[PDB]
Amino acid sequence: PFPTFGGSTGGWLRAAEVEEKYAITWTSTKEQIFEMPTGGAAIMRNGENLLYLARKEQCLALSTQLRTFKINDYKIYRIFPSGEVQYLHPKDGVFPEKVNPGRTSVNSRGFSIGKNPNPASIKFSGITTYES
Amino acid sequence: VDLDYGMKNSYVPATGGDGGQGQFGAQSPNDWRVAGTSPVGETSYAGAADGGEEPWFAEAISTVSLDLQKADETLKAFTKDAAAFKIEEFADAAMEELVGKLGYSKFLEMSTKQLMKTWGTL
Amino acid sequence: ANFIKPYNDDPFVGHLATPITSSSLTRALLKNLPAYRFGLTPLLRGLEIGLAHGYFLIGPFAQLGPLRNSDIGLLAGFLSTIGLILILTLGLTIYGAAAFGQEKSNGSELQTKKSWDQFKGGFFVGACGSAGFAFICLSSIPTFAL
Amino acid sequence: NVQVFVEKDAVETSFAKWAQPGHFSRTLAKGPKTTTWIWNLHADAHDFDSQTSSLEEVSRKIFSAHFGQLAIIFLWISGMHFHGAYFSNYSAWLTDPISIKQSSQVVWPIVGQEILNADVGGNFQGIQTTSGWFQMWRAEGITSEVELYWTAIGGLAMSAIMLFAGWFHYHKAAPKLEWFQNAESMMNHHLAGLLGLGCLSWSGHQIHIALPINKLLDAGVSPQEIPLPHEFLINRDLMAQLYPSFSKGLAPFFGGNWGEYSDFLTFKGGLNPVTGGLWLSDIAHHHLALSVLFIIAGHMYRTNWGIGHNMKEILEAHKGPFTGEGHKGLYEILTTSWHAQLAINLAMMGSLSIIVAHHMYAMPPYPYLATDYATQLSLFTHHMWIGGFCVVGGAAHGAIFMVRDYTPANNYNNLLDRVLRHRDAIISHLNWVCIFLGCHAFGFYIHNDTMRALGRPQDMFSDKAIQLQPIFAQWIQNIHLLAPGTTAPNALATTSYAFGGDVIEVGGKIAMMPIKLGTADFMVHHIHAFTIHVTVLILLKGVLYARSSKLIPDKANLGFRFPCDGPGRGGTCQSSSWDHVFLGLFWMYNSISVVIFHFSWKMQSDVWGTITPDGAISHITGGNFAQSSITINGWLRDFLWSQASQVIQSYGSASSAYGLIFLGAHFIWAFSLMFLFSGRGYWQELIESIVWAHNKLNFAPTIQPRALSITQGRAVGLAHYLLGGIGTTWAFFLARAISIT
Amino acid sequence: SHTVKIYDTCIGCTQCVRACPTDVLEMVPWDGCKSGQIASSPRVEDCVGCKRCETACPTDFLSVRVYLGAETTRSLGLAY
Amino acid sequence: WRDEVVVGITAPVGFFDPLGLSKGKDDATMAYYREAELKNGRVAMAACLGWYLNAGGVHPAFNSELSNDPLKAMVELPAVGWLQFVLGCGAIEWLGQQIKERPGYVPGDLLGASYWVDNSDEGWVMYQNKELNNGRLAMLAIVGMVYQDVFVGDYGDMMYKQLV
Ligand code: CLA
Ligand code: CLA
Ligand code: CLA
Ligand code: CLA
Ligand code: CLA
Ligand SMILES: CCCCCCCCCCCCCCCC(=O)OC[C@H](COP(=O)(O)OC[C@@H](O)CO)OC(=O)CCCCCCCCCCCCCCC
Ligand code: KC1
Ligand code: KC1
Ligand SMILES: CC1=C(C/C=C(\C)CCC[C@H](C)CCC[C@H](C)CCCC(C)C)C(=O)c2ccccc2C1=O
Ligand code: SF4
């Protein structure tokens, strides 16, 4: 289910084999040319498409481009060398820009940015002002 | 398939100036520092591909793939809590009705009142 | 009709099969070089590589070094070549230490500490001996006249 | 079907929008809220494709703006002719071109600046000018200031005509986009009409006017006794006295016995011994043959009569087993993108300017140009700089094409697509080539400096030591020296004496002599190769990584010109293709500086100088190039320190303006480093304290002051860098060359 | 990994989330503002530190703040 | 082998073996014959180009001291140059034999173009035919030029110089 692509020198390197790799799948309703983030143009297949990339940012750039094609079913995974997979995006089946019940807020501080403590007040504690 | 496989890395978060390991882990559990290419008949590292008669390009051979079945299964495994939340708020068999009637991705995408509407049909 | 295709029939790997990377000449040459040739002991890979390099390394020193116009110019060139080989051997030694650690190697593959030590020793011997052989050969250059 | 399609009364003529600064931009139209607005207004003024999404409107704006540029150029030429007519010693210089210094600028007596009116000879005081006007006018046959006045009047008329034409073709009769997309017809007209008829008519002027006037002027006839130009037209006997084949007339031309015209259409080569310039008969034959060639070339493309070539067909046919679809899609690119066309045309025009510089020094085309060392230096240097800027601009507009007009759908598996698909290989190999060239070429100099400093001259790379002879260049020089009798049997002398031959002497000064190439020439030519390769590396990286990279996968969405993508990923400052143009400009400056220094020193050391009637040659710097140019210390001492003497000792003479400009250019160059080394965060914070002081006294602009943008900081820094460095070299060259000429 | 904090001046405009190139941020329910949502950064392991989110944020001063810290492969944006 | 080979068969003469030197030869023998035809043709093409350059006077090596006559320059070249030429060709031949052992090796295909294209493609067959025919012509031309230089004394152009 690979798109029609003649190859490039911009693809993944040894890291994809030994550290981590990324995959993006999506469904197209016709054969259409798109821009590979790694350089050059590829032809989407009618139906399911799968593409491997070195970085998550490359997958998200491609997904941003897919949105201009009216394609919103893309899924982004991370694959480890052992073959374990992580489903990354959209994490809960809903795009992060659309508020969703069941998400919990992470990393909020209940005050305006001007109320962080003074550095001299936490010297030698090992913490930063934004984490305390 | 373990869900914390990414988190079980060797990255030890520092006490300051460090966001730590987030939802999936700060880094891969696999040591990227492996050997360079190797002679004909030998492997550079544990899971390395045998480059056959061209070991110098052995690293260009892919041993990491994503077959569609693994994709669907990890999609379900990683979103099991979100689906559990959606059935908890919409309300076992009911979830099997909804996720086969319209789909699993669609079940995640819809709303509890909307699913209360589609449950009206049977 | 098309002399370029994705390497390993994989469009998404960062490599292309071209005549430079995938011709029969390139493949035969690379598979036959001692760094890759099937069946060699690490010591023999190191020895062949050292023999290849030490022979040509003496030339720049003998012909262009500071003492090139003295009558001991060849001897000085050989000494310079030996010094260069020592520098390279130090590089190989510390490389092996970094890349493989100091634990006992579990295998006989070249990319292991014990095998790399054998390879480094073979390289040192081959290079120094080859520099000496080139010194002998340069001591008497044949004109090739009957 | 090639047809003229024009819309009438396209745009009203009114001053309303002149009162609405920024009207062209939707964002800038709302008016300023900070001083940034002001800068943006000038930056986006001619960025037509960002002011509208219609290609037809962009084409119309471009056409009219081109007319405006033509009007400006005609005004400039007319002004030069008027200054020749009223503020020059051209008449006096005509009588004795050797001892009188050309001068066409005069300054008013105020605050003591009249010292700049040098004693240039001919009962005239002024500034010695180096743009070659007198030589060109004498070559044209101009013998009186009245002819110059009429040429200036016509220049004014043409400037007004171009201005009206621009107004007319924007506001009254604006062509449709289909008109502009007529590549075939445009090529046919510009080859056959513009270039072919231009060459034919100029050859007509040269044959009928310039040739006999110059034959008389060389023969020693006074300018006040030479017949007026129209007499040569109305008196075939006057021409028959000079060139006898004119007594046969045009009968040989239509009969085919063209050999009869061998007396005024020649193939002599070499230089005219009296003037030191090319033979005007050779130049006339050259222009006639070129006119024929261009007129032929202008019938290649099909317009309306069935015959001719379609460019898209030719391009589509050229594809091979290594290149996929090959040239398919290129025609669409070059007929829909103004940036693609501008990239090609700037690259070509700049390269052509560089070629012009070389060819004009080695085969001096105008009389008394070769021994006017100031003019030769200034023309070579000027055209080198123009060419460098134009090649860099071509690169910049290629990058703009990649960002804005490149569409993946129209470039599947063609040459552009495959270049993008192996950009990593291209850039890695170019990087390696640059390192190899730099290390070896510059390490030669560093090795030599170290050897000489250690008292080991015999270990240097030099002619007297380890030698690096440019044997290929020498082989070519010998071939060209032997050409006149054998491989160009009808040529009587060499194309240029730089390749070999005698010394051409004019007024006791050397016009041209063989330029020998040794170890120092090898080293400097490899320095040139190095600098050009690095400049190409920067610019080609800017084009090939314009849309994306492994660092920033979505660069095209950030645009052609953006400062960065933030401090993340380690830091992404200057990742945009505009920043690649920015760095390439510095490298082009480095390259051209080295080229013009090589020219200046080599010509002074080995070519220019005096020559006694006996035959003894005394060069300007005594032949020191070979042993002094092989170390950096020799360049610092024997070139810069030694030849700067004139510019630094110029105070109190007519050259004092050069000393002042030398200093001011140093000042502006150093001033640029404030912008190049700093960042706007500091300056905005300082401006906060200054705005505080103004607010403390109850006043502050509603146009809030802002430090320049990141990209504007870079642009300003680079502009002042180039102005300072180039102006320093300008003052230095001009003082030196006026002294030695 | 970089640190990304959301302060309570957030008006839930979702602009930082749309700006993020690596999907670090997401909108979550919250009763502190009119829009009924606040920004969140559950996936800081993928934050590169580009600060596009800060460029997008309309509040004065910023409601999302990125503090750069310990570098990883992911935060350095390495394809190798 | 005759119903398998297409390269080398071309217009005028079609298949050309009047002596019947290919009948009853095994596939290995005919592969040897094709490899030899190609190698002799390629060597002869290179020899023709080198001879033409030398005869024209374009031999700038050794300060252009060697004679314009190629058969004289052959003996004026020192022994060590010929030793290098022979040993370098020998090393290339050793590598070529290694290539030849490989499965699916096409006789004369050192580049291994079979990894990308085969004779089912028309243009590749046509370009192979161009190579082969020019090789045949160059073999004849090198023999003829050697004859003309040895027995007729003239080492240059005797066919087209008479025109101009
Ligand atoms: C970078 C340019 C450069 C070059 C070409 C030279 C060249 C030289 N230097 Mg100098 N030098 C330089 C810069 C350079 N120098 C610099 C920057 C300094 C510091 C200021 C010096 C300071 C210096 C000193 C103090 C001395 C020299 C000396 C020398 C001479 C002997 C050096 C030697 O034997 O190396 C040995 C070279 C090698 C071991 C290898 C050379 C590289 C090989 C040939 C590349 C082969 C690649 C191959 C073609 C690739 C494909 C092969 C195949 C497998 C496909 C030689 C002429 C000595 C001398 O006496 O001069 C007369 C000397 O005493 N140099
Ligand atoms: C090609 C460009 C060009 C250049 C660089 C020069 C340069 C010069 N000319 Mg020459 N000249 C030219 C073309 C040129 N000229 C042409 C085409 C003609 C024929 C008309 C002349 C005819 C001529 C004569 C007769 C004389 C000169 C003189 C001069 C010198 C003094 C100029 C001066 O200070 O005037 C005074 C400068 C001003 C009054 C500055 C006013 C600037 C205005 C106000 C700003 C305009 C900005 C914008 C357009 C307007 C916006 C606002 C507006 C709408 C209200 C100077 C070297 C003089 C000279 O050489 O003396 C020995 C002199 O006598 N020129
Ligand atoms: C900022 C731009 C700039 C400026 C200020 C100058 C300034 C000058 N130029 Mg230069 N020039 C430039 C760019 C510039 N040039 C470029 C980009 C080129 C490459 C085409 C040239 C090629 C050039 C030539 C060949 C000559 C000059 C000359 C001059 C000097 C006399 C001016 C004049 O009116 O001569 C008028 C020009 C002529 C009388 C000769 C023109 C002959 C060329 C071949 C005509 C080409 C026109 C053609 C239609 C252009 C299209 C190219 C085609 C491939 C599409 C003056 C110093 C002249 C000089 O040095 O005199 C002493 C001179 O002979 N320039
Ligand atoms: C045929 C020539 C030509 C044309 C028609 C264009 C046209 C354009 N360029 Mg290109 N470009 C060119 C050559 C050309 N360029 C060259 C030779 C270079 C290399 C330097 C470039 C490099 C370049 C860059 C990097 C960019 C452009 C951009 C543009 C576009 C915006 C222009 C604008 O609004 O600036 C308005 C004009 C000004 C603000 C005037 C600037 C004054 C300069 C900086 C200094 C002048 C110094 C003066 C001569 C000396 C004074 C000395 C005295 C004070 C003592 C416009 C489409 C921009 C773009 O975005 O394209 C889409 C852009 O970012 N160009
Ligand atoms: C004089 C100051 C200077 C120097 C030495 C350099 C050097 C370099 N620049 Mg830089 N550059 C400079 C000014 C300078 N630049 C400025 C002011 C800017 C701002 C505009 C830039 C912006 C810039 C860009 C955009 C690029 C460069 C690139 C390069 C590299 C070019 C490739 C090369 O030739 O490597 C060879 C090394 C040298 C030529 C330096 C000395 C070599 C010695 C003499 C010989 C070898 C010695 C050897 C290493 C032994 C050392 C002994 C030691 C251990 C004791 C080279 C390292 C380019 C690059 O990286 O391309 C690959 C590149 O793209 N520079
Ligand atoms: C001396 C000038 C500069 C020389 C630089 C390097 C010297 C090495 C020899 C290279 C010349 C031949 C190139 C291959 C021969 C050639 O001319 O093209 C031959 C071949 C053309 O293939 P086709 O027959 O498919 O072409 C059909 C054409 O119609 C193109 O559409 O091109 C290729 O195989 C790919 C070209 C990239 C090959 C990369 C080789 C390395 C290039 C070096 C960088 C060039 C610098 C120039 C930039 C302007
Ligand atoms: C058809 C393919 C062809 C080949 C393969 C070929 C080869 C050679 N030609 Mg010939 N030749 C033509 C065609 C061919 N020539 C044509 C169409 C013409 C009419 C213009 C022509 C005329 C001359 C003249 C006047 C001379 C000449 C020479 C040589 C000699 C040196 C080659 C070199 O170095 O360029 C080599 C053997 C020179 C010579 O024989 O010197 C003793 C010499 O003076 N040629
Ligand atoms: C391994 C690297 C290498 C070096 C370092 C090297 C160097 C020289 N070669 Mg050699 N070369 C090869 C490789 C190398 N060559 C190979 C693989 C082949 C077979 C294809 C080959 C063929 C020839 C032929 C035909 C001649 C030749 C020569 C010289 C000579 C020139 C200076 C001189 O001797 O004056 C210098 C020392 C000429 C000659 O020796 O003339 C008496 C000569 O005619 N070579
Ligand atoms: C000095 C400097 C500044 C400060 C310089 C500024 C703000 C330029 C000021 C330009 C003036 C205000 C316009 C010209 C006006 C004259 C200087 C004075 C005339 C005053 C009135 C008539 C307008 C930057 O903003 C900056 C930004 C990014 C990188 C480097 C730098 C940098 O180096
Ligand atoms: S703001 Fe300035 S320093 Fe920071 S990344 Fe952008 S260009 Fe670099």
Author numbering:
A (entry chain D): 8 to 139
B (entry chain W): 47 to 137, 148 to 178
C (entry chain L): 2 to 147
D (entry chain A): 12 to 752
E (entry chain C): 2 to 81
F (entry chain 3): 32 to 195
Give the original sentences from the paper that presented this experimental model.
In this study, we solved the structure of the PSI-FCPI supercomplex from T. pseudonana CCMP1335 at a resolution of 2.30 Å by cryo-EM single-particle analysis. The structure reveals a monomeric PSI core associated with five FCPI subunits. Based on this classification, the five FCPI subunits in the PSI-FCPI structure are identified using five genes: RedCAP, Lhcr3, Lhcq10, Lhcf10, and Lhcq8, corresponding to FCPI-1–5, respectively. The PSI core comprises 94 Chls a, 18 β-carotenes (BCRs), 1 zeaxanthin (ZXT), 3 [4Fe-4S] clusters, 2 phylloquinones, and 6 lipid molecules, whereas the 5 FCPI subunits include 45 Chls a, 7 Chls c, 2 BCRs, 15 fucoxanthins (Fxs), 7 diadinoxanthins (Ddxs), and 3 lipid molecules. The PSI core contains 12 subunits, 11 of which are identified as PsaA, PsaB, PsaC, PsaD, PsaE, PsaF, PsaI, PsaJ, PsaL, PsaM, and Psa29. Psa29 exhibits a unique structure distinct from the other PSI subunits in the T. pseudonana PSI-FCPI and engages in multiple interactions with PsaB, PsaC, PsaD, and PsaL at distances of 2.5–3.2 Å. Among the FCPI subunits, only FCPI-1 contains two BCRs in addition to Fxs and Ddxs. FCPI-1 is positioned near PsaB, PsaI, and PsaL through protein–protein interactions with these subunits at both the stromal and lumenal sides. At the stromal side, I138 and S139 of FCPI-1 interact with K121, G122, and F125 of PsaL, whereas at the lumenal side, multiple interactions occur between I109 of FCPI-1 and F5 of PsaI, between T105/L106/T108 of FCPI-1 and W92/P94/F96 of PsaB, and between E102/W103 of FCPI-1 and S71/I73 of PsaL. The protein–protein interactions at the lumenal side appear to be caused by a loop structure of FCPI-1 from Q96 to T116 (pink in Figure 3D), which is unique to FCPI-1 but absent in the other four FCPI subunits (pink in Figure 3E).
